[PDB]
Amino acid sequence: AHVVKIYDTCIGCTQCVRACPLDVLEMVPWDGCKAAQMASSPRTEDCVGCKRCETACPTDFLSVRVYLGNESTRSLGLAY
């Protein structure tokens, strides 16, 4: 039940998508960049709040931020 918002400064590196294990980020076409790509966060219900993605973002400041919030079974990474 975490929140994942991506901002206007994305450049279509795809390093955020390759990093986050839980497949919570995918690439969508867009007209704003040279690469003509942008990220997205359709399924944040599966977000474990690891925050690996933010590390991948190579911009001056993060175009992808994971604002932690209410917890859940999927978010707490509980096998039980």
Partner 1 sequence: MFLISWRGYWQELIETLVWAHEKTPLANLVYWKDKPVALSIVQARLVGLAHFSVGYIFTYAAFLIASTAGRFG
Partner 2 sequence: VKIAVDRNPVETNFEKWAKPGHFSRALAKGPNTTTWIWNLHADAHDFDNHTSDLEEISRKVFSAHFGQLGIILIWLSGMYFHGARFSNYEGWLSDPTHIKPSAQVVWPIVGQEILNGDVGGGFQGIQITSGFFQLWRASGITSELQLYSTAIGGLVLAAACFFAGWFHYHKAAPKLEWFQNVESMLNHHLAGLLGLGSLAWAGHQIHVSLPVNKLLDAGVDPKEIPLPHEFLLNQSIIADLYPSFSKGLAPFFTLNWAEYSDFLTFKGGLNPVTGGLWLSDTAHHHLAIAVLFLVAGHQYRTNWGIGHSIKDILESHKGPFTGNGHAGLYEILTTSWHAQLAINLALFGSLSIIVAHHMYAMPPYPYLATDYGTQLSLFTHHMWIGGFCVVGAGAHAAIFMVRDYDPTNNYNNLLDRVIRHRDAIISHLNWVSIFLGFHSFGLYIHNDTMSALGRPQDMFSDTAIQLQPVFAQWIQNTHFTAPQLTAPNALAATSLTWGGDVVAVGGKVAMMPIALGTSDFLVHHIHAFTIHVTVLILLKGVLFARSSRLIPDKANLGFRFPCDGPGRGGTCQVSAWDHVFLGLFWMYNSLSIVIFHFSWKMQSDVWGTVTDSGVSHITGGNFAQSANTINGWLRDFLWAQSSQVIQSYGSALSAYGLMFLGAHFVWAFSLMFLFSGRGYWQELIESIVWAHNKLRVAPSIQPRALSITQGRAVGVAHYLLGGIATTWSFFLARIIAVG
Partner 3 sequence: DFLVHHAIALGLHTTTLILVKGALDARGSKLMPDKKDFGYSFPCDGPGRGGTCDISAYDAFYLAVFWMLNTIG
Q: Is 53 annotated in some ligand binding site?
A: yes
With contact defined as beta carbons under 8 Å apart, do 73 and 3 qualify?
no
Instruction: Confirm or reject binding of residue 55 to partner 3 (CB under 8 A).
Output: yes
Q: Which two tokens stand for residue 68?
A: 């932690």
Instruction: Confirm or reject binding of residue 52 to partner 2 (CB under 8 A).
Output: yes
Stretch that binds partner 1, among 3-11, 39-47, 51-59, 72-80 (CB under 8 A): 72-80
Alpha-carbon gap, residue 76 to 72, rounded angstroms = 6
Q: Is 33 annotated in some ligand binding site?
A: no
- The one-letter code for the residue type at 34 is K
Return the number of the residue (36 or 68) whose C-beta is nearest partner 3.
68
